[PDB]
Motif scaffolding. Structure first.
Motif, PDB file in Angstrom:
ATOM      1  N   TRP A   1       0.822  -1.207   0.000  1.00  0.00           N
ATOM      2  CA  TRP A   1       0.000   0.000   0.000  1.00  0.00           C
ATOM      3  C   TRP A   1       0.857   1.258   0.000  1.00  0.00           C
ATOM      4  O   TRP A   1       0.559   2.223  -0.716  1.00  0.00           O
TER       5      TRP A   1
ATOM      6  N   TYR B   1       2.205   1.670  -3.432  1.00  0.00           N
ATOM      7  CA  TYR B   1       1.171   2.130  -4.350  1.00  0.00           C
ATOM      8  C   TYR B   1       0.914   3.620  -4.193  1.00  0.00           C
ATOM      9  O   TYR B   1       0.780   4.343  -5.187  1.00  0.00           O
ATOM     10  N   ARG B   2       0.846   4.101  -2.954  1.00  0.00           N
ATOM     11  CA  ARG B   2       0.540   5.511  -2.747  1.00  0.00           C
ATOM     12  C   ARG B   2       1.731   6.417  -3.030  1.00  0.00           C
ATOM     13  O   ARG B   2       1.548   7.529  -3.536  1.00  0.00           O
TER      14      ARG B   2
ATOM     15  N   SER C   1       2.527   6.696  -6.783  1.00  0.00           N
ATOM     16  CA  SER C   1       1.521   7.472  -7.495  1.00  0.00           C
ATOM     17  C   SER C   1       1.829   8.962  -7.489  1.00  0.00           C
ATOM     18  O   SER C   1       1.037   9.743  -8.026  1.00  0.00           O
TER      19      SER C   1
ATOM     20  N   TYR D   1      -0.831  -1.851  -6.455  1.00  0.00           N
ATOM     21  CA  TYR D   1      -2.205  -1.938  -5.973  1.00  0.00           C
ATOM     22  C   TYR D   1      -2.769  -3.334  -6.197  1.00  0.00           C
ATOM     23  O   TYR D   1      -3.429  -3.900  -5.314  1.00  0.00           O
ATOM     24  N   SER D   2      -2.503  -3.911  -7.371  1.00  0.00           N
ATOM     25  CA  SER D   2      -2.942  -5.278  -7.630  1.00  0.00           C
ATOM     26  C   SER D   2      -2.289  -6.257  -6.662  1.00  0.00           C
ATOM     27  O   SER D   2      -2.938  -7.194  -6.182  1.00  0.00           O
TER      28      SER D   2
ATOM     29  N   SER E   1      -4.005  -5.998  -3.297  1.00  0.00           N
ATOM     30  CA  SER E   1      -5.305  -6.659  -3.329  1.00  0.00           C
ATOM     31  C   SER E   1      -5.151  -8.174  -3.301  1.00  0.00           C
ATOM     32  O   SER E   1      -5.900  -8.868  -2.606  1.00  0.00           O
TER      33      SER E   1
ATOM     34  N   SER F   1      -8.373   9.889  -2.922  1.00  0.00           N
ATOM     35  CA  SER F   1      -8.457   9.359  -4.282  1.00  0.00           C
ATOM     36  C   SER F   1      -9.394  10.199  -5.147  1.00  0.00           C
ATOM     37  O   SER F   1      -9.116  10.456  -6.325  1.00  0.00           O
TER      38      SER F   1
ATOM     39  N   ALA G   1      -9.580   3.575  -8.922  1.00  0.00           N
ATOM     40  CA  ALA G   1      -9.089   3.312  -7.574  1.00  0.00           C
ATOM     41  C   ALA G   1     -10.107   3.739  -6.525  1.00  0.00           C
ATOM     42  O   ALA G   1     -10.343   3.020  -5.550  1.00  0.00           O
TER      43      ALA G   1
END
Lengths: 213, 204, 204, 213, 213, 213
Positions: D167, D170-171, D174, D189-190, D193, E166, E191
């Motif tokens: 996580w 991912y953040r 970005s 992100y995938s 998950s 987001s 997202a």
């Protein structure tokens, strides 16, 4: 029961870093311990041991802090070496509806039934309420503590060692994600997931999650 | 004596049933068993005199379901309904005259009233029934007839819905077996283990 | 006495039903039980005179289901229907003459009327019925026969639609058990726990 | 019971920024706390805290503000240490229909039933109304408050460290800078998950959702 | 109950604009408040507030203007502190077919039933007609008023903080729509939608719309 | 109850035109009013106005001209403030078959039934024929008249501000100039459709269409 030294040698032989300069021994050990925790989560059959745990007075109990989930509580260990009575699981809601003050019931020398809910991992109730720290063997999803040194031993099975090799390949090859947009890292992740999927021996990860008791 | 002897059969047919639930099922099944079989008997004596509806003393884990007979100063008394006194012996409730007792009526749940009130010892020979909250069942229910009570309790427990215990087939099967065993044992009050014959009373 | 002793059985079969609805259904099933078993009994004494249609006095958490026997100042009276009076005794309603009481009439729900009206003590021995809102049931319902009333109440709760507790087969089974137990206990009025025989009246 | 220091060390190793220059330590701490909250929401079994809470007198009660959703109310805590009675869930609408003035009746020293609606998370009703602030054990999905400093401890299990790392990656990846990559962010992100998906131990997330009792 | 400052700090760390010189604090606050309203609409369980309101005389009533929709009317608040009687929903058409002048019926001290239609959001009828402004607790989906200042507090739950981050990424990255023809904005929207979809706690947005009561 | 100024600010923020030089404020006001009409059409629950309307004597009646479609006719307002009788819908064809001269029947002070056909929106019939212009509440999907000025207020709910913004972007970016883009226009139309689709509160648009009572 393999040491961390082998796994570090493997991962330092896949990546052409044998003297450990891009990937130092400490961070590779970190990836080893993270992979051990993740693989125990994915397949609980990898790392199970029975632990003697005393129970504080009262119905409410807390499992040992570094345990993900207890699967079975087979035997209630009597004082000193005597194996003692065994324990079977039951449902808390029926224990609650009738005899609502079942927590206030007189504590017992040996617990007879335990209640566990997958939602609440750390808390399991014992019927009757425990007394004076009676110890019980617990079959719980223990989490590997850490890998601080190369010679430190991993108490896990000796094929999950190759699974850890693949997971460490994932966690190391995501560092140079610029190459192929992480395609090689995704390939190692897929290889690792397939390696645990085709584990015919332990808990089947391919089938329904938590279906196995 | 404890219900922990009944519990293993319940575990075998009802896996991991909670102990209070299985115990309540045991108590209810044994209550019905004593209703049908009427085997449990105990003997009690107390002093009754000067117009009190005295209550029968019973063991803590028991209740007086049915009185086989009552003796008053060594006299076999005749139990009769209250309406029988109402039509045959008028001024029953009103009169306070004392006399030697002849007939018994049970106006309350456990209280015995004697048609003449008198001060004397009263012996009640009656059947017993386990109470709805009894820790220990009698030796008769536990040692020799554990299987029938277990079958009844398994019926009650398997009928429980929304649980892993639920199975209608086993519930019906155990209910039928419990009924058949109770039905066979119904005659054990008269026959007993001594093979006492059953013979209809003749009125000429 | 309180219904919280009935509650464990219900929460065993119907796990999370709210307590007030469970209480209401237990009271309703107890009403049906006392209508069929006719076991609850109580006596009251009160004075009636000067053409007064007095009402019976009963314990607050109960209602008078039915009068077993009525006594005026020591006389066992004969209950009659009002139409029976209209046939046999004309001028029942018109006359005001006082005389020795002979027959009982219940024109209203709970008011008893005597064909001769005079001033004297009235003793009524009548069967009792729990009211629709009674906090505590008497001992004979709860302590001894909680299973049957629980059976009835579980029937009414399991009938409830569109909820997690709904189960048609369970409701039918519990209702059948309730009916059978009521059927078995129907004769306890004549019998009691004393084993009084039931004998038909002979008319010559 | 792992501190935030280890997870920040991971995130500093994955992103090719160990000095925490471009991704400041406060920023990575903020991503760590966001990840903890997100994991608690996705899988409530990650962080469920048994909190004893006093109840305002009356039928209406408010869940502790730092709680996502109450899952069970196992024990009605008697005064001082005694565990007291147990509490079982009921239906609020039937509590309304019968005895419509159920809010107005005499309060009870120990509550006997509680009604909770998922649509309204912050309100749960107790039956009978509580008296003199009687406390009850509340098992609710606690939200991890914050990660102010690097040495701050994270109360969740150590197994979700991989999900927290994914996580944070991912953040952070970005970010709209040269040093951050986008396809890497999508893949991370995938990965997060999927890592939450194969948690065979805790509450299932892929197969069954929101159906856990 | 997080302030707007934390969310603006997030968005200022996602977009490499810490000074807020491209995305000013005012317009970021605007995106925050728009996202709060939108997320409350998407998942009413995110922000449910129980508000006491007086009821104007007559059967016809109007819920507070800053509310999207009321779900339940739990308690009819008696004068001053007394919680009073509770209210249950009914069918207005059956109330109309018989006793057609049920609006002209004598007003009652306490309303007994209310009728609410999802089609007509702002109007709900009460039976019997209300009298002299009796106050009734209303469980209605309140809309967040606005975010005028950085220090202003957002009283919604604290993972919707990440969801708002987001959404703010969506709204800010829609300005520079040239880059990949808004693919980055679409990715942020996906997202956000996935974050709300996997909200296992609150009202399930994945399942049928308005299926939850 | 939001004014148009806020939505115009949003639109001037998405399009990289704060000064409103290229997309004139009049054009954005027009796009706002068109968006209001379209939102009311897609989801009638957005703007349903309960208006009291006098009825021309006779069976034939016409709903107020500034109304797309009448949904319900709850109350037949008595003279002055009295709410009066309620009205229930019926079938026109049976009203015509039996008593074919039902139009010629004597007028009634209060109408007792109304008939509405979706195919003919502008006409609804009343039974019995109305007398002396009796006024009746109409619950109809009102259409926002116009947005003439920046400070003009929008009676629509503040939740649909995102949908209005998306519609304004769709219509402004579809302009045939260098300063407008088409792919972003299609994406904005899709975003508007999705934002209206996930409106879990009001009238459903994806699953059930035109089936709302």
């Amino acid at each position: 029961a393999f040491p961390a030294s082998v796994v570090l040698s493997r991962a330092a032989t896949l990546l052409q870093d044998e003297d450990h300069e891009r990937w130092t021994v400490d961070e590779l050990l970190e990836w080893l311990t993270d992979g051990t925790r993740e693989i125990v989560v994915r397949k609980p059959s990898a790392y199970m041991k029975t632990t003697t745990a005393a129970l504080v007075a009262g119905s409410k109990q807390a499992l040992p802090e570094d345990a993900i989930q207890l699967i079975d509580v087979p035997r209630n260990l009597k004082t000193d070496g005597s194996p003692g009575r065994a324990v079977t699981a039951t449902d808390r809601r029926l224990l609650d509806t009738e005899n609502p003050d079942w927590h206030s019931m007189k504590p017992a020398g040996q617990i007879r039934h335990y209640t566990y809910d997958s939602n609440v991992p750390t808390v399991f109730y014992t019927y009757p309420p425990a007394a004076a720290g009676v110890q019980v063997e617990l079959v719980c999803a223990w989490r590997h503590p850490a890998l601080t040194t190369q010679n430190d031993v991993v108490q896990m099975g000796a094929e999950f060692v190759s699974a850890l090799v693949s997971w460490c390949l994932y966690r190391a090859s995501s560092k140079d994600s610029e190459f192929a947009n992480g395609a090689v890292a995704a390939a190692h992740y897929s290889a690792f997931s397939d390696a645990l999927g085709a584990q015919a021996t332990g808990t089947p990860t391919t089938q329904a999650a938590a279906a196995a008791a | 004596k404890p219900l922990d002897v009944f519990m293993p059969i319940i575990h075998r047919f009802a896996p991991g049933c909670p102990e209070p639930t299985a115990f309540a099922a045991i108590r209810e099944a044994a209550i019905k068993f004593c209703e049908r079989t009427r085997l449990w008997r105990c003997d009690d004596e107390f002093n009754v005199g000067a117009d009190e509806c005295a209550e029968v003393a019973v063991p803590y884990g028991a209740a007086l379901y049915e009185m086989e007979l009552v003796q008053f100063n060594g006299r076999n008394m005749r139990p009769v309904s209250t309406q029988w006194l109402d039509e045959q012996v008028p001024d029953w409730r009103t009169t306070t005259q004392s006399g030697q007792a002849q007939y018994v009526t049970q106006q309350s749940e456990d209280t015995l009233t004697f048609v003449p009130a008198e001060a004397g010892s009263v012996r009640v020979y009656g059947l017993l029934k386990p109470t709805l909250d009894a820790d220990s069942l009698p030796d008769l229910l536990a040692d020799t007839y554990r299987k029938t009570i277990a079958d009844g309790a398994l019926s009650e427990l398997l009928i429980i819905p929304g649980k892993a215990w639920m199975s209608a087939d086993l519930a019906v099967f155990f209910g039928t077996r419990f009924d058949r065993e109770l039905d066979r044992l119904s005659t054990k009050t008269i026959k007993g283990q001594q093979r006492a014959p059953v013979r209809t009373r003749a009125q000429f």
